[PDB]
């Protein structure tokens, strides 16, 4: 009954999960456990930035995980997703610490999709960059340990007021607007998603990961979703 | 309680309102006697793209109605636009009707709100183009006798099965998503729309009009906004 | 010497240069066969939408055309486009005729090229859209039988005064400026285009096609890319 | 038989020029003594970013400029511009360090703008953001000191290999492909400048200022241009 498609970026090798040993990555569709995954090397006190997209007659939803002067790591799916999802999705993103504590903070957060198709020439879409993330959104929507104004920094998980981020937080924030990707004469069909994080962890060997989903139009946390379960599968590893 | 900032389409000279001797379209702040006019020649039959733009800066309300091979129809005004709306404002369309038919019959629509100063300097947008409107909208937002669900196009009046429009209807759609022109961190709020019409009524006096509008969140039709009123205004100018 | 990759609306069939069986679209990388194709069916009088779209991550060459009420063409063609492309590339359309009449009549056209990754993560981009083509362009630039000036239309191929083409044209228009898809600092270059197109010809074979392409910035008109060749290639197959 | 139109940012009270005493800005057309005038408090190490817009059916050429956490500067001019300028024009911003050095660093240069009217429902758009400044733009035009490649900056003045600004640059970058603000139908017709530019000096009361400027296609730098006469006017102060 609760579908959902995000962007995978375990950070802990939850090898538990069958998963890589270590920080991959991967489009889980519908079940926590990726279809296709790969490495990805983190970093500390360093923003990260990730990067969707799809096309309905390419079949391929993908990404690919960078920080500068650096490398990044990119994936990719042939895939319908016309399968995977229903006509009308909400996008949102959210992370989960585990065990462990961290900072899923969320920096620069854009979505832009397009329609068209039908050869009517006419295209449609929906977007909007976020970069002030003020205290209330009123268009996004918040869920869990996702506080919202800070600095301009978005925080999908919980933190002291000092500097204590803690190590079971699991949010969601999401577009308050539901997106698309159904429409008859459809033909071709994008968004691209695409973010500034930046994870940080006193610890050495940081819980947990981050996730980008579409999904239901009122999704809403897993009774799961924890760790691993990235805050979107309601568990069932 | 409600407040709304937004530009009608008037199509019945209404003298008695202060509708003066012909069509005009109004910016209205609050009473359908539009602070500044022009004067209009409602073309039926026929496709027009009404407008509308922003400063921040500059802060001059200005729309402008344009038919096709003939000449257009400027006219603004100047407010501040921040003493009026509520920080962050959800919008849509409008229009009614009252003692004849007539089709305010919409093509398509167009809106983009750009927000910057912040001395960040990157944009906070949302944007969105209908050119598509299918059976029930999910962004959208109908409002009375205004249905969505006829021909990729989206009708906010009444109108009959094989084409005969009856003339006590009232028709408002917004956006599922509130909307933001503020930001403290702001210095240059910005926003633009535009979408084609359409309106037949075989008559020859075919009224009332329409009118680009936005306002508070919880605005719903005025009881008795009509014929003038708008579906907006509570009752009176 | 000169470089082109693009999509060719081939409307007929040459069999004896491995123009199969009927009108097929094509993704040629130097020749006038296409590595990959899919049949078409050419529709006078008639407004259609070509396209095409790529990705940096992904690179999938895939265009796609489209005429109303009836269903589409797709076909794709995965190439890595930054091996055979140079740095810096400059573009516009083309198309020929030899041996009857037709239309390469264009309606209207847009492109858009974002170039990230960086690591500096804000997106370069270069992008337009006509949809007015008046006399002269001065943006553009015409390339033969190719004119610009007779009703917010551009026409790459020759046709007499009140509506007689001729059949020994050829018409190529590009960019003012030259274009970038690769940047040292890139990891994720994307670029877009769609025009509307309308090839008449009172025949029923006009030929003998057109297609969407690129190219270095001192590529001009093949002395003989006729009939097929397309107004490209040098001359052969 | 040179024109052009920038918006001025002497950052030296070239009081001669009757100019206002200090850092101003202001809104030349054609004569190197602005139109209005308006304070700014410049700051040093410091990165700026200016801001322009016009709107046709507006009238009012303007800008700010703003400082993040401090203030910043408007202004603006009701004026028509189709006046002060040709159907077709090429943009472009340049500085000048006078009898003192600094340097005329462009960061973040970006510009749009955008046509319809008609309403012939079409609009028309030209528009590049431009963030990671190679050697050698091919797509912009530079002219005089205007070095480009240094580590994703512009630098339109002089400047050494080790830290050593000169102070007699005059240089002059703009878009390759040139602009517009003609066509009939014409009702309506932005376009956004805006920049993140950032000067410095090790000296106390430095000279002298930077510009914007749309012009000419083919303008050129003024055998006067130098200190206050910007870079753009021929000189007669």
Redo the contacts between chains.
Sequence with gaps: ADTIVAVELDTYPNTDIGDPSYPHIGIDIKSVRSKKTAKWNMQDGKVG?A?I?Y?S??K?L???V?????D?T?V?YDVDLNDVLPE?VRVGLSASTGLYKETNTIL?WSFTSK??????????????????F?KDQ??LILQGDATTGTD?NLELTRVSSNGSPEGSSVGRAL????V?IW???A??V?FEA?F?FLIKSPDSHPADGIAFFISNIDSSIPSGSTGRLLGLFPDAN
Excluded: C
Excluded at 66 to 70: D, E, F, I, L, R
Excluded at 115 to 132: E, V
């Design positions: 930035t990067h997209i096309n007659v390419d391929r993908s990404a690919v960078s920080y500068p002067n650096a990044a990119s990719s009308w620069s329609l068209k198709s039908n050869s009517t020439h006419q295209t449609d879409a929906l977007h909007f960059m976020f970069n002030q003020s009123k268009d301009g577009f308050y607007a539901p698309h429409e008859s004469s033909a071709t994008s695409t500034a």
